[PDB]
Symmetry: C4
Subunit: 394 residues, 4 copies
């Protein structure tokens, strides 16, 4: 359709024009989109025809925008057009706000069960473990089998993401950061089951990375909270635009001077590359030891290197990272809000493919008062609408 072709390429001017057309003419109500029904005292109502916007067949304007390949003109600004913004607010507060908070309540009760099933793991060797008849057993083994089943659930839910949208290796690593992190979490959990029944103690490695990931994935549910959701979008921007640029340059100075400190150190505990790469990393934390070794030669060389480390990477690069984060906050004060609107918009559309059996409640704002004097005949119950309101001063 030519409407969805404007949405797919991101033509924001045309998409504003089609969703907001209105003209006073005979045989124009067959063509017009925005209808103005009630003209009372200066607050005037408005009805948007909403034909293929929300509930179209296999190509809907909400589904075209929210599933974009992130290479469009402006995928984040199209949801600010007057029919689309209030409808997603209407589908939120009426329908999906209750079913989103229940999903966050399940996942918060998922990680409590999975923590307490891992916190009280058995300590003796040779997995697996014959559960005793005690009250502590039959009560965390039920905690384990629920926690494994959650890793199975996010695995099959992670596959059917890829089986539907198919981001195809570029929109994967660019526009779908959230669904990978649910999948990699479930991937460590299933590897930790395979290593558990193969009688190896290294399952607790993959369990921990399945547990460290799982709490950091709880920032996914900060969307649906406006002040928190815009905050978690900014955390995404600091990783992709500052630690992409800091941790390259920092690890050059880190691995650079640590290889310069080893070759000066003659022998001892810190003779390896690993044991002194920590000792130069401790300056970044705030636990840097200047005299961390004595067994070398040329003390004047050894402390010029540390001072050239501390001047270059501690009182410059960490104090420069704070300044560059200070500029990307003022730059992404508006763009990070619009990216939050798109993150809510995906979660709204995801539940309509989930709670699809009761498809009547997904429809918005009634289907009535359609065709006032249609030229093809009397079809005044054809298309839906959505009521808004306006302001004063004529």
């Amino acid at each position: 359709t030519p409407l969805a072709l404007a949405a797919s390429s991101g033509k924001i001017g045309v998409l504003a024009y089609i969703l907001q057309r209105e003209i006073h003419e005979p045989e124009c109500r067959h063509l017009s989109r925005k209808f103005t029904e009630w003209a009372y005292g200066p607050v005037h109502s408005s009805l948007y025809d909403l034909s293929c916007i929300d509930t179209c067949e296999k190509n809907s304007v909400l589904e075209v925008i929210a599933y974009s390949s992130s290479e469009t003109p402006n995928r984040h600004d199209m949801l600010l057009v007057e029919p689309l913004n209030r409808l997603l607010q209407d589908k939120w507060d009426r329908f999906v706000k209750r079913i989103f908070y229940f999903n966050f309540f399940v996942y918060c009760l998922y990680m409590i069960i999975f923590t307490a099933a891992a916190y009280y793991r058995p300590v003796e060797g040779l997995p697996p473990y014959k559960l005793k008849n005690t009250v502590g057993d039959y009560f965390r083994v039920t905690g384990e089998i629920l926690s494994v089943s959650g890793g199975v659930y996010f695995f099959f839910r992670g596959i059917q993401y890829f089986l539907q949208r198919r981001p195809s290796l570029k929109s994967l690593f660019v526009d779908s950061y959230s669904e990978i992190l649910f999948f990699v979490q479930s991937l460590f959990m299933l590897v930790s089951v395979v290593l558990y029944f193969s009688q190896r103690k290294e399952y607790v490695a993959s369990m921990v990375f399945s547990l460290a990931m799982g709490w950091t994935n709880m920032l996914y549910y900060t969307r649906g909270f406006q002040q928190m959701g815009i905050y978690a979008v900014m955390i995404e921007k600091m990783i992709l635009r500052d630690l992409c640029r800091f941790m390259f340059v920092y690890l050059v100075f880190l691995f650079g001077f640590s290889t310069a400190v080893v070759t000066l150190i003659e022998d001892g505990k810190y003779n390896s590359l690993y044991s002194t790469c920590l000792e130069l990393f401790k300056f970044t934390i705030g636990m840097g030891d200047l005299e961390f070794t004595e067994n070398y030669d040329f003390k004047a060389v050894f402390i010029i290197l540390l001072l050239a480390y501390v001047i270059l990477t501690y009182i410059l690069l960490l104090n420069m990272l704070i300044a560059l984060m200070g500029e990307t906050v003022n730059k992404i004060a508006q763009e990070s809000k619009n990216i939050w609107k798109l993150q809510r918009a995906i979660t709204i559309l995801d539940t309509e493919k989930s709670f699809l059996k009761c498809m009547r409640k997904a429809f918005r704002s009634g289907k009535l008062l359609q065709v006032g004097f249609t030229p093809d005949g009397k079809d005044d119950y054809r298309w839906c609408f959505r009521v808004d309101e306006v302001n004063w001063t004529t």
Copy 2:
């Protein structure tokens, strides 16, 4: 009254119109508010009729604005209208500035007595304590009974706040942060008396929280000092808008990775959840120890977790908090000043209900030259006024 109805809903345009009306017409001085008496060389005087603004009966415009429910249109901007701003400056420098500094001088001499009565507390067991005939006794027991009486005073003064304004469970936790903190301070002090005479050593817990709170409550008196008062408003904004958003996300990463570090640690001192949640909190301070334990397995797993902690929460989240505080300073450079004007305005109105017996000094700028040719008759001593001045250029 229709004037206070504009103040209660926060109609700033109407409230500017009523307090500043003036027109040259016969039988208009009965209706006009702003009077221009002395028209000398280009500095021209101005008199504001001030009828129900300051000293009305049970609904005054200062009392309506300053006791707002924080849900109005602009409660912080209405005090910038030309009669209201200079009057609160006039009631400050003439009347309430002396009686405010005495209240800060009492409370500063309250916390010195309450500190020194707690610093020299008796150390032996089984409270209470038979005071000896020494000079040190009969000199801190008098220090205690004054300090208990201060907790009684802020308790009854905290009740009669709630018995008058009745914030009703929403304006309580939103618009009245200061009066709760005086009340909770007095609440710990009275619990520390009940535990004292019930022969339990745990009174010193509630005494300390009554003493730690009491010095932090001394930031209440930073209002009445313009450069300090605007500074303490900004401390309120950083708690409610940044540590509301930092300490949620920080404690997710903190409790997330600390539960990931326990389940890797086999046994030892740091096997509990509490003993290692401190050890990951020490990275935020600047005392983080990378090799804080050795009794585990898979050292490569244990230090990926700490590095994934330090990268995520130390060189990102603390360096992001500084950037987000850097944006909310430039955003609240003006709003935090106007909130300080409202905090002074409450303290001005609070003393008129306190020093009410000498109610003549509360009246401002005389009650004279009222009705120049009133149409109802000769009533030229009816209503008050307030003199201002103007500038040059006609």
Copy 3:
């Protein structure tokens, strides 16, 4: 004079008008200030009459501006008027730049002598000390008597500051920070001589404060270096506007919670108020120890207090100070430059009262081509001038 009355009150509009007047009329060259001599191709010269501006008798416009009481309208902006700004640049690069750098070269060679005379102080008891016949003696005792003489010099130079300008107890602590710090430095040095010959070892206390002050006073000479001088003005603004507002609130939380930690601590090493006020100050540095004591009761109370300290004063107030310094840089990006221009302007005028015996070199830009057809007669060598240049486009 009415010219200096505009400079004393800071009327910048009138002062721009008097120093830049020019009109084409007969008998106007007796009244005009700005003369335009050479009108070549579009670069046009300009001559400023400069009568009472620089070299007046007992009231000169440079001396009136630069010796202001800091209560004027704009004392920092009057030096941007076109005759005054290029003249101070002319007196700098031609005359005072060489004699300023020699004063910085003496004072830099003063603190090297005074350091090395204190670094090698004798270590045995009972001052004073009979100097031996060694080569090390008769070589630092000469270093001492030069360093004492420098303290005598800054003492008498500090008195004759006050004997001339007389800031009178308000402009002292507001507009003359630099001359106090040279005086207090010399004051510790002279007290350290009185305690030296009175056979008390406490002279080394006042010597150290005379030595710690003396190197911090070397930031005085950062003026005369434009990028450094504007930087040292900003250090003055961070002390007077941020550490005036931080160190009040910080010491309230510091002394507040430290008195809350003592009264919980039963007995031991940290039972005093002083020994734990350091231990809460170490959290600000980055050396804060959470488990710094064990001899108390109610461990849950003891670590709520430390966490309520660290949350309130470390991850809030130090991270808020960086944000507030980030706003006062953008606010004082222009004002701190103009304050540097006034700090140079005082140092230019101070040497004309110092190198006064050769008063001919202090005069600027010649005294010639004065009165072209003066109406009182032929007086064409009466008043001086100063040549400038202009730009293209007619």
Copy 4:
């Protein structure tokens, strides 16, 4: 030539005029520069005559701009003129992008060889070392002789820089920071060979400074990556504008108070100036020890000095450096991008003097359709061109 005279002095208005002239007149195509060949639907082509811009004889406009003495009007803005900007983009993506990445791939494989040849250096005394017949030998000695040859290569490539451009002692230390750091790296490597065969163990000093420098020189290749290259320009600006101004003032307070701490310390381990200048430097890192010594007198003096250190240089100067970096990011948000465009432009022109034997591929955009009706005759294959494109709306 008068064109290059506009480029050498940096007349950006004239240089925009000459490279973009076009007029419709007979006998104007002999004089015009910008040709508009294809006028289709509203995208219109454009051809730039490009005569002495890129491939002139001994004075080319790209070579004049990119080899400027940094004292011109705007050397960084001239590359934004419409022929020059797209041509350097054309010579990048077509020709030099492949040969730049190979140079970064060689140098990255140079420092890996030079690290691993230094990491496994022999530990016994008396250099040089008779290589054994083992497999580890004949495999790092080949690693050494490649790493020495790289120091020889950057030495002769560093000389022929100076033998061609001749920056002449002012553009050396101002406009050529990169080529010095490649040269000083090679200078330490060759000194480390001379000390190696002169049987002295101090070669490992100069090897380390040749290895610490060499990894920091890998930030040279961040140009050619747009988000990284603009980032490394900003690192240059923080060194030259903030650590030029911080490390002067910081070392005054550091050396100031450390000389004040020595003269108070009577005797012991920290009696020297060096041993306590570290202990005051550790406060900047975050490892400052307040009670780092006890053997002195007047403890009240000793901790006023440390608190006057920590207040002045830790909670002021490091927190002021972050604010001043926060202002020079917003100030150099645009200038640092244009300096990156000039750093790419030098690397493009450097390879045309390197890959000069295949000089045909250096020519851009063909040499055809030159002279449409030249007045001197038929010379329609005289000068080259370069095709661009334009936008809609007539």
